Every structure is written in C-alpha cells, then in structure tokens.
Structure 1
Amino acid sequence: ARPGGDTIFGKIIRKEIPAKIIFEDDRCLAFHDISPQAPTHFLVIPKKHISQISVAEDDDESLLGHLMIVGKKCAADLGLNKGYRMVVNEGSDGGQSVYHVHLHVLGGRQMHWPPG
C-alpha cells in the first residue's frame, strides 16, 4: 500500500503522474484541476488517504481544517481578491469523482446559487 493510495490523487502525491502544483507541505498538496469549472479552479488534498468525508475520523479535524487554511492562502496567492467558493463532494449525489478527499477552490468569476 503506497502512501496516499492509487487513485489519481495518490499518484499525484507521489509525483508518479504530473500536476501543476501550487503549494505543498507535509500534510497536503494544492494543484490545478485539469477540467476547470471556473477561470481559477484548484484542489487541496491530504497526503493521508481518506476515501471520502463521510468516513473521516474525529482525529482528522485538524487536517481537514488545514485543507481550508491552505485553500484560502493559495486563493490569496493566486489573486482571487473578489472571493471564491470551496466545495467538498461526497458520494454519488455529491458528484464525487475520485475517492480521495479533496477540497475544490473555484474563483475568477461570479459563482452562482444554488451551488449545483
């Protein structure tokens, strides 16, 4: 079991498939989404493999919050001074496409309501 698993996001964590990386630390990785839904659209993922938010453990709280802190810092570093939307998808109704926890950050245009 290679660290991070073998979803595309685990492969990206281990530099086995390429990504456009914005920020990296010991806990997480921020990189651009290849199918962007906004002028800026990136992902913040833990390096620890968690398949989906519905199975996150209570002790994962700091790590999950760290994704949002890194997300808002990256958004500022990318000049998203008018704001942005953060999204976590869970399961089928959530539209989750990769079963490795990930925070979407979208900006550079007016986001609309409802959020899908």
Structure 2
Amino acid sequence: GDTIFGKIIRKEIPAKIIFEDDRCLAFHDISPQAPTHFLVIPKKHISQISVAEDDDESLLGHLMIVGKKCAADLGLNKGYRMVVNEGSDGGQSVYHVNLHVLGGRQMHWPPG
C-alpha cells in the first residue's frame, strides 16, 4: 500500500528536497539522527530490500551514487554512514525502500 514517502514523491506533502531525477528522490529526514541525515528513495515502490528484484540492481546502486554525491554537496568531507533497514529487527520505519545517509558527527559502533 501507499506510504508517506509516496506522498512525498507525488509532492502532496512537503519535504526539504535535496535532489531529484526521473527515478529517485533525495530529501532531509524529518527526524534527523545526525547533523546531516537525509534519505534517497526510488520512485518505483519497492516496499523493502528483501523483495527487490534482480532487475533493480542498477537502480539500487543509483541510490548509493546519488547518496554519495549529495553527501559531498552537503559538505560531509569527514565521512558518513549509509543505512538500509529491513523489517522489524532492522527497525524499518516506512515500507518504501529508503537509503539513509548520516553525517556531521562521529557515527558509533555497533550501528544500533
């Protein structure tokens, strides 16, 4: 079913958009866990990484390339952490695939 991230893609509710193309959208997370914390999501509604199809491989990599380019544009020259959550144990909060990018502070270990 639809999620709040679908509404964001459709521009029905506001978000602070960082980057957009024909197949993905990057925007700041509304509940930031670091001084910079944004999401990169595909426009295709893949609900979770566990159901991603083989044909989605380059799209998923595109999310990471967009994410790293956005991180550089946002000044994260000391580094950052990328996260994808799956399911209950993964703490996934929205059932639309989303790549978190967090930086601007030391990220710790374990990663949750």
TM-score range, shorter chain: over 0.9
Q: Across the two proteins, how many residue pairs are aligned to each other?
A: 112
User: 2:72 is matched with which residue?
Assistant: 76
TM score, norm. by length of structure 2:
0.99
Unaligned residue ranges in structure 1 (runs of 5+): none
Unaligned residue ranges in structure 2 (runs of 5+): none
Q: Is 1:55 aligned to 2:51, yes or no?
A: yes
Query: Partners of 2:111 and 2:61 in 1: how far apart?
Result: 21
Q: 1:24-76: CA deviations, max 9, x gaps?
A: 00010000000000000000000000000000000000000000000000000
Query: Partners of 1:97 and 1:39 in 2: how far apart?
Result: 20
Shift of the alpha carbon at 1:81?
Answer: 0.2
Task: Give the share of equivalent positions with the same residue, in percent.
Answer: 99
Query: Partners of 2:27 and 2:102 in 1: how far apart?
Result: 12
> What is the RMSD computed on CA atoms of the aligned residues?
0.7
TM score, norm. by length of structure 1:
0.95
Q: 1:1-36: CA deviations, max 9, x gaps?
A: xxxx62000000000010000000001000000000
Following superposition, which runs of at least 4 residues in structure 1 exceed 3 angstroms of deviation? none
